[PDB]
Amino acid sequence: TCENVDCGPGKKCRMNKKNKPRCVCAPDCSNITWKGPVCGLDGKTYRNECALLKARCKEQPELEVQYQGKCKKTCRDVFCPGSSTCVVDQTNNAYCVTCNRICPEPSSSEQSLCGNDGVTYSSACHLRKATCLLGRSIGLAYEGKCIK
Protein backbone atom coordinates (compact mmCIF):
# COMPACT_ATOMS: atom_id res chain seq x y z
CA THR A 1 0.00 0.00 0.00
CA CYS A 2 2.17 2.84 -1.38
CA GLU A 3 0.97 2.46 -4.98
CA ASN A 4 -1.35 5.42 -4.47
CA VAL A 5 0.75 7.66 -2.16
CA ASP A 6 2.53 10.68 -3.64
CA CYS A 7 4.86 12.83 -1.48
CA GLY A 8 6.02 15.50 -3.93
CA PRO A 9 9.53 16.33 -5.09
CA GLY A 10 12.56 15.31 -3.03
CA LYS A 11 10.55 12.45 -1.49
CA LYS A 12 9.39 8.83 -2.06
CA CYS A 13 6.97 6.43 -0.32
CA ARG A 14 8.50 3.39 1.41
CA MET A 15 7.02 0.62 3.55
CA ASN A 16 8.28 0.84 7.10
CA LYS A 17 9.12 -1.65 9.89
CA LYS A 18 5.45 -1.97 10.95
CA ASN A 19 4.08 -2.38 7.40
CA LYS A 20 2.79 1.22 7.14
CA PRO A 21 3.36 3.59 4.18
CA ARG A 22 5.84 6.41 4.89
CA CYS A 23 7.45 9.29 2.99
CA VAL A 24 11.23 9.31 3.06
CA CYS A 25 13.91 11.71 1.77
CA ALA A 26 15.22 11.17 -1.73
CA PRO A 27 16.80 14.31 -3.23
CA ASP A 28 18.04 14.49 -6.86
CA CYS A 29 21.77 13.82 -6.77
CA SER A 30 22.12 13.07 -10.45
CA ASN A 31 23.98 16.14 -11.55
CA ILE A 32 26.23 17.41 -8.86
CA THR A 33 29.19 19.25 -10.51
CA TRP A 34 31.53 19.33 -7.51
CA LYS A 35 32.27 15.70 -6.56
CA GLY A 36 34.28 16.12 -3.37
CA PRO A 37 33.56 16.95 0.28
CA VAL A 38 31.65 20.10 1.10
CA CYS A 39 31.32 22.32 4.18
CA GLY A 40 27.73 22.91 5.19
CA LEU A 41 26.36 26.10 6.69
CA ASP A 42 26.04 24.07 9.95
CA GLY A 43 29.86 23.92 10.11
CA LYS A 44 29.82 20.17 9.40
CA THR A 45 31.91 18.51 6.68
CA TYR A 46 29.86 16.30 4.35
CA ARG A 47 31.39 13.46 2.19
CA ASN A 48 29.74 15.04 -0.83
CA GLU A 49 26.89 17.35 -1.75
CA CYS A 50 24.44 14.43 -1.96
CA ALA A 51 24.92 13.65 1.75
CA LEU A 52 24.32 17.37 2.45
CA LEU A 53 21.06 17.41 0.41
CA LYS A 54 19.74 14.36 2.29
CA ALA A 55 20.49 16.08 5.68
CA ARG A 56 18.73 19.19 4.35
CA CYS A 57 15.63 17.16 3.48
CA LYS A 58 15.79 15.08 6.64
CA GLU A 59 16.80 17.54 9.38
CA GLN A 60 17.76 21.13 8.28
CA PRO A 61 15.63 22.67 5.56
CA GLU A 62 17.97 25.66 5.00
CA LEU A 63 21.24 23.70 5.09
CA GLU A 64 23.44 24.70 2.10
CA VAL A 65 27.05 24.25 0.89
CA GLN A 66 28.86 27.39 2.18
CA TYR A 67 32.14 26.35 0.55
CA GLN A 68 33.74 23.37 -1.21
CA GLY A 69 36.18 20.98 0.48
CA LYS A 70 36.17 20.05 4.18
CA CYS A 71 35.21 22.66 6.84
CA LYS A 72 38.35 24.47 7.92
CA LYS A 73 39.81 26.25 10.95
CA THR A 74 41.08 29.76 10.16
CA CYS A 75 40.28 31.48 6.90
CA ARG A 76 43.74 30.74 5.43
CA ASP A 77 42.74 27.95 3.03
CA VAL A 78 39.11 28.90 2.41
CA PHE A 79 37.76 30.10 -0.93
CA CYS A 80 34.35 31.76 -0.59
CA PRO A 81 31.91 31.63 -3.52
CA GLY A 82 30.56 34.81 -5.15
CA SER A 83 30.76 38.06 -3.24
CA SER A 84 30.92 36.25 0.14
CA THR A 85 33.98 36.55 2.44
CA CYS A 86 35.44 34.51 5.24
CA VAL A 87 35.03 35.03 9.02
CA VAL A 88 35.90 32.77 11.96
CA ASP A 89 33.55 32.05 14.89
CA GLN A 90 34.27 31.46 18.63
CA THR A 91 36.23 28.30 18.19
CA ASN A 92 38.14 29.40 15.04
CA ASN A 93 35.83 27.63 12.43
CA ALA A 94 35.69 29.34 9.02
CA TYR A 95 32.37 30.56 7.58
CA CYS A 96 31.64 32.25 4.23
CA VAL A 97 29.17 35.18 4.75
CA THR A 98 28.01 38.40 3.13
CA CYS A 99 28.97 41.28 5.50
CA ASN A 100 26.48 44.08 5.99
CA ARG A 101 27.95 47.44 4.92
CA ILE A 102 25.13 49.84 5.67
CA CYS A 103 25.16 51.61 9.05
CA PRO A 104 23.00 54.67 9.87
CA GLU A 105 25.18 57.47 11.32
CA PRO A 106 23.92 58.35 14.83
CA SER A 107 23.48 62.08 15.61
CA SER A 108 25.08 61.81 19.07
CA SER A 109 27.80 59.78 20.80
CA GLU A 110 25.58 57.94 23.27
CA GLN A 111 25.76 54.83 21.09
CA SER A 112 29.60 54.99 21.01
CA LEU A 113 31.59 51.84 21.83
CA CYS A 114 35.27 51.19 22.52
CA GLY A 115 36.62 48.13 20.72
CA ASN A 116 39.41 45.85 22.05
CA ASP A 117 41.44 47.31 19.13
CA GLY A 118 41.44 50.78 20.84
CA VAL A 119 39.14 52.13 18.17
CA THR A 120 36.02 54.16 19.01
CA TYR A 121 33.03 52.99 16.99
CA SER A 122 29.96 55.22 16.59
CA SER A 123 27.49 52.40 17.16
CA ALA A 124 27.19 48.62 17.47
CA CYS A 125 26.52 48.49 13.70
CA HIS A 126 29.89 50.17 12.98
CA LEU A 127 31.81 47.78 15.27
CA ARG A 128 30.02 44.77 13.76
CA LYS A 129 30.88 46.04 10.27
CA ALA A 130 34.60 46.37 11.05
CA THR A 131 34.44 42.90 12.67
CA CYS A 132 32.88 41.10 9.74
CA LEU A 133 35.25 42.88 7.38
CA LEU A 134 38.33 42.08 9.54
CA GLY A 135 37.36 38.40 9.55
CA ARG A 136 37.29 37.73 13.30
CA SER A 137 35.80 39.12 16.54
CA ILE A 138 37.32 42.36 17.80
CA GLY A 139 35.05 42.56 20.81
CA LEU A 140 33.89 45.31 23.11
CA ALA A 141 36.46 46.75 25.57
CA TYR A 142 33.69 48.89 27.23
CA GLU A 143 30.69 51.00 26.21
CA GLY A 144 31.35 54.64 25.40
CA LYS A 145 34.21 56.32 23.56
CA CYS A 146 37.68 54.94 24.19
CA ILE A 147 39.35 56.80 27.08
CA LYS A 148 42.51 58.62 26.13
Binding site: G43, E62, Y95, V97, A124, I138, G139
Partner: protein, 105 residues
Protein backbone atom coordinates in the same frame (compact mmCIF):
# COMPACT_ATOMS: atom_id res chain seq x y z
CA UNK B 1 -1.55 17.72 4.61
CA UNK B 2 0.65 20.80 4.99
CA UNK B 3 1.72 22.83 1.95
CA UNK B 4 -1.33 25.14 1.54
CA UNK B 5 -3.48 24.44 -1.48
CA UNK B 6 -6.95 25.71 -2.39
CA UNK B 7 -8.94 26.06 3.05
CA UNK B 8 -8.10 23.83 6.04
CA UNK B 9 -5.10 23.58 8.45
CA UNK B 10 -1.89 23.69 6.43
CA UNK B 11 1.71 24.87 6.24
CA UNK B 12 2.33 28.04 4.31
CA UNK B 13 5.86 28.38 2.96
CA UNK B 14 7.00 31.90 3.94
CA UNK B 15 10.35 33.76 3.69
CA UNK B 16 11.37 36.40 6.27
CA UNK B 17 14.24 38.80 5.62
CA UNK B 18 16.34 39.89 8.58
CA UNK B 19 16.94 43.21 6.71
CA UNK B 20 13.09 43.76 6.51
CA UNK B 21 12.96 43.12 10.25
CA UNK B 22 15.97 45.30 11.13
CA UNK B 23 18.28 42.50 12.31
CA UNK B 24 20.70 42.34 9.34
CA UNK B 25 23.60 43.83 11.34
CA UNK B 26 23.00 41.59 14.37
CA UNK B 27 22.54 38.37 12.33
CA UNK B 28 25.57 37.68 10.17
CA UNK B 29 24.13 34.68 8.38
CA UNK B 30 21.83 33.74 6.87
CA UNK B 31 20.26 36.90 5.49
CA UNK B 32 16.71 35.41 5.78
CA UNK B 33 14.93 32.05 5.70
CA UNK B 34 11.73 30.18 5.13
CA UNK B 35 10.33 30.35 8.65
CA UNK B 36 6.88 29.33 7.36
CA UNK B 37 3.60 29.43 9.26
CA UNK B 38 0.27 27.74 9.77
CA UNK B 39 -3.00 28.99 8.29
CA UNK B 40 -6.56 27.67 8.03
CA UNK B 41 -9.69 26.28 9.76
CA UNK B 42 -9.99 23.71 12.59
CA UNK B 43 -13.40 21.93 12.63
CA UNK B 44 3.72 12.92 17.66
CA UNK B 45 2.40 14.69 20.75
CA UNK B 46 4.02 16.25 23.79
CA UNK B 47 3.32 14.66 27.09
CA UNK B 48 1.05 17.60 28.01
CA UNK B 49 -1.05 17.29 24.82
CA UNK B 50 -1.27 13.57 25.35
CA UNK B 51 -2.58 13.68 28.89
CA UNK B 52 -5.06 16.49 28.14
CA UNK B 53 -6.29 14.74 24.94
CA UNK B 54 -7.65 11.87 27.00
CA UNK B 55 -10.21 14.29 28.68
CA UNK B 56 -11.20 15.67 25.24
CA UNK B 57 -12.85 12.36 24.27
CA UNK B 58 -16.56 12.68 23.36
CA UNK B 59 -18.65 12.50 26.55
CA UNK B 60 -15.66 12.47 28.95
CA UNK B 61 -16.03 13.76 32.58
CA UNK B 62 -14.22 15.89 33.57
CA UNK B 63 -14.05 17.41 30.10
CA UNK B 64 -11.29 19.55 28.65
CA UNK B 65 -12.94 22.05 26.26
CA UNK B 66 -9.71 22.89 24.52
CA UNK B 67 -9.53 25.72 22.08
CA UNK B 68 -8.41 23.73 19.07
CA UNK B 69 -6.28 25.41 16.48
CA UNK B 70 -3.97 25.18 13.45
CA UNK B 71 -0.50 25.17 15.05
CA UNK B 72 2.93 23.75 14.19
CA UNK B 73 3.19 20.04 14.86
CA UNK B 74 6.77 19.69 13.58
CA UNK B 75 9.63 22.27 13.73
CA UNK B 76 13.22 22.17 12.43
CA UNK B 77 16.51 23.79 13.59
CA UNK B 78 18.66 26.24 11.58
CA UNK B 79 22.29 27.26 11.97
CA UNK B 80 22.97 30.96 12.47
CA UNK B 81 25.96 33.22 13.06
CA UNK B 82 25.27 36.37 15.03
CA UNK B 83 26.91 38.84 17.41
CA UNK B 84 26.59 38.19 21.16
CA UNK B 85 26.64 40.89 23.87
CA UNK B 86 30.38 41.27 23.72
CA UNK B 87 29.94 41.74 19.93
CA UNK B 88 31.81 38.47 19.37
CA UNK B 89 30.97 36.24 16.40
CA UNK B 90 29.02 33.21 17.55
CA UNK B 91 27.67 30.26 15.60
CA UNK B 92 24.81 28.14 16.92
CA UNK B 93 22.41 25.45 15.64
CA UNK B 94 19.12 26.85 16.93
CA UNK B 95 16.23 24.42 17.50
CA UNK B 96 12.58 25.12 16.57
CA UNK B 97 13.30 27.85 14.01
CA UNK B 98 11.29 26.61 11.04
CA UNK B 99 7.74 25.37 10.80
CA UNK B 100 7.84 21.99 9.00
CA UNK B 101 4.26 20.69 9.59
CA UNK B 102 0.97 22.11 10.81
CA UNK B 103 -2.02 20.43 12.43
CA UNK B 104 -5.18 20.92 14.44
CA UNK B 105 -4.40 20.75 18.17
Amino acid sequence: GLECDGNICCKKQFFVSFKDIGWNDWIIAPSGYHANYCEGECPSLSFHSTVINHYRMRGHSPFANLKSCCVPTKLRPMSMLYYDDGQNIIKKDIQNMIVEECGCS
